[PDB]
Design a protein around this ligand. Sequence first.
Ligand code: PEX
Ligand code: PEX
Lengths: 78, 540, 256, 48
Amino acid sequence: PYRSILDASLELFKFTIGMGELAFQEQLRFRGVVLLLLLAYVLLTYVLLLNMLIALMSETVNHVADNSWSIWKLQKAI
Amino acid sequence: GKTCLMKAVLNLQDGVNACIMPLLQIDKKLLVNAQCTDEFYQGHSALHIAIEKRSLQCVKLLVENGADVHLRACGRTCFYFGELPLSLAACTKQWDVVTYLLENPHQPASLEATDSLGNTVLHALVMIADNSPENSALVIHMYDGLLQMGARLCPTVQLEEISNHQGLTPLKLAAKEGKIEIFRHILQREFSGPYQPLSRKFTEWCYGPVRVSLYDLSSVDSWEKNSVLEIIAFHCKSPNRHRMVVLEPLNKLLQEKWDRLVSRFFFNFACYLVYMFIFTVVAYHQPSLSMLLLGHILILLGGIYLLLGQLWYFWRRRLFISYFEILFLLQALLTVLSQVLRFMETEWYLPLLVLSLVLGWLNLLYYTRGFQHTGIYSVMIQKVILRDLLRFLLVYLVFLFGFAVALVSLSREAPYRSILDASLELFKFTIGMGELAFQEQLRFRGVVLLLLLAYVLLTYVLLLNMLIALMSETVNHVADNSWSIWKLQKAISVLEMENGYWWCRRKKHREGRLLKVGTRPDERWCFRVEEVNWAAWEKT
Amino acid sequence: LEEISNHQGLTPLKLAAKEGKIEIFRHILQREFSGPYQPLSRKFTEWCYGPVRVSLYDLSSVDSWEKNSVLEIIAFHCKSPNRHRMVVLEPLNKLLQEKWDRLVSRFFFNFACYLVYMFIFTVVAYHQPSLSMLLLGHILILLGGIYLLLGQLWYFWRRRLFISYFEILFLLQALLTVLSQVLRFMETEWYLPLLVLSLVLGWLNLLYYTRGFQHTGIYSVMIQKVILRDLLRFLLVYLVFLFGFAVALVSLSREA
Amino acid sequence: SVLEMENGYWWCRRKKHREGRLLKVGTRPDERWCFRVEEVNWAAWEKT
Ligand SMILES: CCCCCCCCCC(=O)OC[C@H](COP(=O)([O-])OCCN)OC(=O)CCCCCCCCC
Ligand SMILES: CCCCCCCCCC(=O)OC[C@H](COP(=O)([O-])OCCN)OC(=O)CCCCCCCCC
């Protein structure tokens, strides 16, 4: 568990597809600090996802349906 | 505490009363100087009472009676206008009182007189202003009239360059109060007639659609010890900070500062990213039990330098007490604490080193405001997301501890062995990992399942509420606001670094070039904006 | 003529509020006359000094001191959706601000004395034996439950025509706490589940006081108004799907 | 919230207090209770 950069990176990325475990595993020393860091990582990943969603919504609000049809006509011209 | 003079100065037919003159004649202490002494209003006399009534005849009679216009009121919701009778004309949009109060018979009542609160007539006209368009127009017209009249009374005195008790000129006071309506008029003020020396904006030569626009940078170029830019960045407190920055020539001056200070901003970014990378490398190869020693001494020097680089910031800017400005101090402090704890109680040093590394990797996001294609992106994280997620998380923790204690109390008969385990299991239903089981090893499995179902429903309710709040904020949001606040952030960045690093104390350089118009010499610093405007040209 | 009640006992000023007819109500409340009809006016100006305007208002049958007034009718007896719109209009907004700035000293006391009860309930539940100070908690939670039970029955004894989301939960939680502390003497097997079900309802009812803070009032609205109005409809359809698919799966999975 | 608590707690039955102050205008005496709002309005004043 977390033997190298690759394993830890994979475990942290696992909290995107909603699969990673958030455990107070005590086989590894400083379990409290590990749990706190994982909690902070989860919070920051949710912050980033919320920021991406808000950016997409801001783009959608300023968007217009006729613009999509116009750019599709441009693509057909190309 | 009202005297017979106040009763005479009271309202009467046609806004005048012959008893006011008869009372003064019958007196021959002056009855005109009599004023109330109550805590609600002390010093309010007939001189201001008649002026507030907009009675030109009564004011003229009182002046002829020997009333001293230089007398100032005091005392306590009320009118925040100045105590000077000359500033009392702000209660009249037609300047009827001021028309006589300037060059009156045997009572000059000069505008240069300072009020009891310090602010002059021009400063009072900006303090008593409002953001409403009607109030804005009323303030602008009165300010223009007062400035024009100033050229015919004590013309050698610069009425717009006198500071109050706080040390701020009306130009600085308008920025501090965040009163953008009057501030825009003051900053871009121009006159075509004899008031040309009083103007700030000038046009040099219009060639086709190209317009050269000069501006006056007096007390605005940030070279002086106290200017508009420094007040807006740090001393101001109004939400309108992000709106004043857009207005020219502040935008152009900030652009010129940025295009000359990127050469140091990117150097700072590189020399901080190198420190972060070295910190990461040292942490990764940290022993569990020569080059590594070099890293530790470097991270000690690197931490100390950054610690001083932020204490110097908090030693300054005392009234400014900025989100990232505390984290850099905190990360440097924790790094120094860790490198000190390496000599005593070494068991805790590595956790502190990791907690410093994570804060460094998060503080690296500060420099994202320096790139044009990431400035807008860097705004929404700080402004709204961190303002709503904290409120969401507090409610979530309130739910979490309560449900954890409930589960621990319920599961006490024939997993969830303590508060910590139950809290972790309940929090697990956020990353979509926790199990929702009818586990029968623990007694009351039905009630446990019902409570877990209720917890899941309430967590979804809280998440939906957070999403709806974010959507409500997004709908009311505007794309130009993000760019404006990013420009404000760039202004904050440049004004800090223009003062120079703490160790070097880089000397300041005066912006613009010396230009003179008319004659007071009138030599002054100016900054040359060139703009193309077909619509404005079409009015010729 | 404006102070005569109908068969229902309501004056036209009160009737306009009850019907939620904000258009006429705003005119009636802020009515003013400059001529001989000055005594008929309600709004007055005393002295205008520069931009500062002093505006007097008539609080006859509006100050909530009388046995039946505009405020009480709007809060409880009214049924129109326009209740949230009449409150903004002055001087009702100013009167409510003055009442709030004088009753926060009791609202926060109530919040503290309910949070203490909730904390004691939590502590007693956590250390509850599976088989002196603990006995003190049980008698306190019994007295605390009874007091809150009476504090809500007194509400439902009143406000008969008003039959409020939180007002039923506080009664329900107190009733369940009392029921649990009674069942501790007979059929004790079920007492702990009821104690936990009361604790969770207490921790949810704690959210009622969030309306007392200016920086949480807006936040506390959207939960009650819309989310609980739509999630119930979503969950009913979800359960309809759930039971059907569950029966289908059980019927289908009957062979190796 | 305020109208419920102004009636007082069930056990104590707190006495009510009349809001505002007594003011009289014109003559019917016309003594009545009034509440004094102070507001600043430049736009309304500009109509004078
Ligand atoms: C030259 C070799 C330097 C080796 C690394 C030394 C430690 C650097 C630590 C570090 O991150 O400093 C950042 C800082 C600039 O960013 P900032 O202060 O704006 O970032 C924080 C803003 N809130 O850095 C500076 O201001 C100094 C940059 C180096 C110039 C030489 C300094 C000599 C001192 C006597
Ligand atoms: C003084 C020590 C009291 C020890 C705790 C007693 C049990 C308190 C239970 C409790 O939560 O009561 C809340 C209530 C106030 O909130 P509310 O009724 O508005 O909350 C519900 C709103 N829907 O409380 C009150 O109204 C009373 C507060 C205490 C004052 C003394 C009372 C004496 C009675 C004879």
